[PDB]
Design a protein around this nucleic acid. Structure first.
Lengths: 73, 73, 71, 71, 72, 73
RNA sequence: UUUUUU
């Protein structure tokens, strides 16, 4: 079910989507996006930026900065 | 069939291609392209920018920003 | 054949067969205009005005051809 | 255990257990100073002054810790 | 040989065997002019005027050789 | 044993560690570090920079420039 | 750690 050693990432990205937490996604190119996590697979993350969809590649993502801290285990 | 854990990206890029949606493609190098998806494999995306083809490597792609939101599941 | 790179293996081959001239945009903003001689999974051999150019795919951003490739 | 991530899995864990303070240099020149909360194969979760920061490893350049880690 | 890095393993080999001098353009704009001593899957060992240079392939952008390499 | 086709890199970094050779490590982001290799696994290199430890990811490293040339085979 | 999450 789970897959070896991306527990932390799949969990974190899941809660942000589930808990509708707002986050600032920092891209590597200095650009940033503020919005909510709609969905994600292994290589991409779908964002909702004010009603608009944003398909972002993980290799372009630098940091996830959430407005609310996510509870861990 | 054949998948892996890359459901979200393969479905999304196909719909953009199927629905002939116009999208703004931001590259990692800051450059951007506005056009429509013709085809894609694992590593490249073929784009139609004003009638002209553009073979873009996914590792150069940062975000897909579509004029129309793509239907999900 | 190898799954999930039909499109790239096809496209780069056509540029090579039909001797299409292309502008190769690198990620670092640099660009090269030339013709595809050969390519394998990680590199592209380019012919830039008689000069050979071995380019790594991770450095390539976009392929912009003078002539569109048949689909 | 997993072949040849001995050094990294040990190092990042010690930073987390001993709560060593570290400056994380990103590839884009930006930096973050904080403590390791958790990490998997692709991400490192940081605590920057009470605020969480999910950082992708491909964006990280260097880990510079306030205290040297015992080997 | 191994799976579809034919072109690269051959080219880097000829440059080393035939001692052709090449300019290596790095991604960060930096460049190095020298000769290929050795290489494995992730690194290239370079000779820049007697000095060794271990370059990671992910940092390499382009190989520009002084002499064109025959092909097959 | 265990290898793959990364012969040249594992041998070289080991000798730098074994021979305690001083090296200038150029990062992709232009930064430099002068120090000695303490240890390395597949993705990271632990450096000794003026007595201080530096965990550097290989993907950030561009070139290893050693004060002494390292013996090969 | 050399072609889309170390």
């Amino acid at each position: 079910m789970k897959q070896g050693g991306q527990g932390l990432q799949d969990y974190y990205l899941n809660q942000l989507r589930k808990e509708k937490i707002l986050a600032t996604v920092f891209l590597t190119n200095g650009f940033q996006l503020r919005g909510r996590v709609v969905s994600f697979d292994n290589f991409t993350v779908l964002l909702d930026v004010e009603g608009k969809q944003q398909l972002v590649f993980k290799h372009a993502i630098s940091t996830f900065s959430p407005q609310k801290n996510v509870a861990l285990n």
